[PDB]
Design brief:
The structure is a homodimer of 344-residue chains.
Chain A (H helix, E strand, L loop, with lengths): L2 H5 L2 H11 L2 H8 L2 H13 L8 E5 L5 H8 L4 E6 L3 H11 L6 E5 L11 E6 L11 H7 L4 E8 L2 E9 L2 H11 L16 H9 L3 E3 L11 E6 L10 E9 L4 E15 L4 E5 L11 E12 L4 E11 L3 E10 L4 E8 L4 E2 L3
Parallel strand pairs in A: 1-2, 1-4, 2-3, 4-5, 7-16
Antiparallel strand pairs in A: 6-8, 6-10, 7-12, 9-13, 10-11, 10-12, 13-14, 14-15
Helix pairs in contact in A: 4-5, 8-9
The structure holds sinefungin (SFG) (2 copies).
Catalytic activity (chains A, B): L-arginyl-[protein] + 2 S-adenosyl-L-methionine = N(omega),N(omega)-dimethyl-L-arginyl-[protein] + 2 S-adenosyl-L-homocysteine + 2 H(+)
EC number (chains A, B): 2.1.1.319
GO molecular function, one term (chains A, B): protein-arginine N-methyltransferase activity
Chain lengths: 344, 344
């Protein structure tokens, strides 16, 4: 028993760490230039937060962030990695002649032993919609190793949500589902499953990007301060919203993105996944409503987005929304574990 | 516990049956017109093999093949399905007014109880390169329920292999692996992992289609007779080959496809996934050599393809090949579980 094993189905964990054991998957993240370059910038431009310091890298993967901490002058970097990627990180530490400074520790951060407390924790634990993968909890957990007044890079995370209109995306779900609305598919009446098919498609958050013109109101922001938050704070995430509609139209759902800030002694550096910013491997995420809501400019769209952590390293998403002026309401349940990857 | 649980890692099984629980995935198979239409043809044109007979459908999914057995006049059809798709099949059986003839039985065919021995077993248990998923073993296992001189649909399966030349494919995989040849990726020397990266990328069989002109020799055929084979026969599959090269050039690997035959009392019907035939959702599969072999027209390319079943419902593929005239040899290990889907 650890904190990780207690919150995670073994079958989910096996698949998860298998995925990250692939060099190709580490490469995918590494080649996201906005991601990798911003981390390097955050670390190097805040060199005083690393110079002669003790560092923990939570989920080091290839080791890339630990190498940046080394470039910034860290004395010692504990690089923790639970997948078989830990073996490859070790190879790189030796080939880059950094054995005196980067120590790879294979295992889950919730299960390993560190020899000493650290000045600063670095990690890239963000998933889709920020919270997917539940690795933010591992990052917060790692604070048991943090010296008092130690730092976290990133320091804070902001989730943004905004209502969108996208009639073509909405309609696409019914078109797919209507495969089932055939009374004689090779002589078989499939129609009884059409509703189940619709339900299945609407349960998948949509991962892709979009034009900012689809957004119908200024975003609402939910902030997690990684210096102050406890792991338990991420088990149930309640995001109330009150959108003041800037455009009239049919609201088909809520769009999500996230930013993180590295609040260093020299400067604050932001990594944004917003649709106004260059694209990242996180794209953006949209959660559809099964019934859209009509709203006019100046109306208020109010409700709650409730994210409930599950044992498959993800979240059950519940979105309830109403147009206050008409009482028209929509209620939606989504499975963040299994998004629809729409981008092309 | 059961023959299934003994040969299968739980984490693999969970993911596998989750996949097939999706209506979208059942739809993907159902909409393969060559697949679904050829099954219907095989069954209906051999109506005497079904008329007033008892049938087992191994892995019924939506129920579609059981409906075809019903159309052909079967008295009773036991439709076994281990995913939650079984519940959707039940719905269709009721909505098609076939409750008197199709009996859905939720569970693994190696764990359920059938009330009764059967005249004929129908299944679509073919994966990529025929053997992926190890469902052919469940199909063979189901023969414990088959009456003496009962039939199997499909009855036999042929795997074809042929050498191919495709420099562009080769270079694409090598280009991706060569990400890890860089001496200064954001200042970090990745080159110590280049060999491991080549191994990983070359370990992935390539799923897509191709022009038949890339083939350098007539195919070699390996046949599995489903009437006679035992599940244990699929644990280690040894396919010797001796290709008489028709064209001179660089051999970049072996291409694989498969056919199955439904040997009925009225006629034999073939389902082919060959690159000479209309495309199916199985496409074709190519196993690259890390280093290509030069051969001249008239040379012999000889060796063995060895498929060793693993607990992740797939196979470790070993391909050893040599050009007899020069002694040039290539030895390759591939992981059929995790193919590169290139057609997308
Ligand atoms: N609980 C955990 N303990 C240790 N490592 C973990 C844990 N959870 C996730 N990881 C690893 O964290 C890494 C997360 C990656 N997104 C980041 C890799 C790398 N730090 C990079 O920035 O490129 C993966 O390699 C996971 O295997
Ligand atoms: N051991 C097993 N016991 C019961 N069902 C299985 C087993 N292995 C695989 N399956 C199911 O077999 C089905 C395989 C599909 N290729 C076929 C579905 C359907 N018969 C069709 O032809 O459309 C999936 O629905 C799996 O969930």
């Amino acid at each position: 028993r650890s904190v990780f094993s207690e919150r995670t189905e073994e079958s989910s964990a096996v698949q998860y760490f298998q995925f990250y054991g692939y060099l190709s998957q580490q490469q995918n993240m590494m080649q996201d230039y906005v991601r990798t370059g911003t981390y390097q910038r955050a670390i190097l431009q805040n060199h005083t937060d690393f110079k002669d310091k003790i560092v923990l890298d939570v989920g080091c993967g290839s080791g890339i962030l630990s190498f940046f901490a080394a470039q910034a002058g860290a004395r010692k970097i504990y690089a923790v990695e639970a997948s078989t990627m830990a073996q490859h990180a070790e190879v790189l530490v030796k080939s880059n002649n950094l054995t005196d400074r980067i120590v790879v520790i294979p295992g889950k951060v919730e299960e390993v032993s560190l020899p000493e407390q650290v000045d600063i924790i670095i990690s890239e634990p963000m998933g889709y919609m920020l919270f997917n993968e539940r690795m933010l909890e591992s990052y917060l957990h790692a604070k048991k190793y943090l010296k008092p007044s130690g730092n976290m890079f990133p320091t804070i995370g902001d989730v943004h949500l905004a209502p969108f209109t996208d009639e073509q995306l909405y309609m696409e779900q019914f078109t797919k589902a209507n495969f089932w609305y055939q009374p004689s598919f090779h002589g078989v009446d499939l129609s009884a499953l059409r509703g189940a098919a619709v339900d299945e498609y609407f349960r998948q958050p949509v991962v892709d990007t979009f034009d900012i013109r689809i957004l119908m109101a200024k975003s609402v922001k939910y902030t997690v301060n990684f210096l102050e938050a406890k792991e338990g704070d991420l088990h149930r995430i309640e995001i109330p919203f009150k959108f003041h509609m800037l455009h009239s139209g049919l609201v088909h759902g809520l769009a999500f993105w996230f930013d993180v800030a590295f609040i260093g002694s020299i400067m604050t550096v932001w990594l944004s996944t917003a649709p106004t910013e260059p694209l990242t491997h996180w794209y953006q995420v949209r959660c559809l409503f099964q019934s859209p809501l009509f709203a006019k400019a100046g109306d208020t769209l109010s409700g709650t987005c409730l994210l409930i952590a599950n044992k498959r390293q993800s979240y059950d998403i519940s979105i309830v929304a109403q147009v206050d002026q008409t009482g028209s309401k929509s209620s939606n349940l989504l499975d963040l574990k299994n998004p629809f990857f729409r981008y092309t």
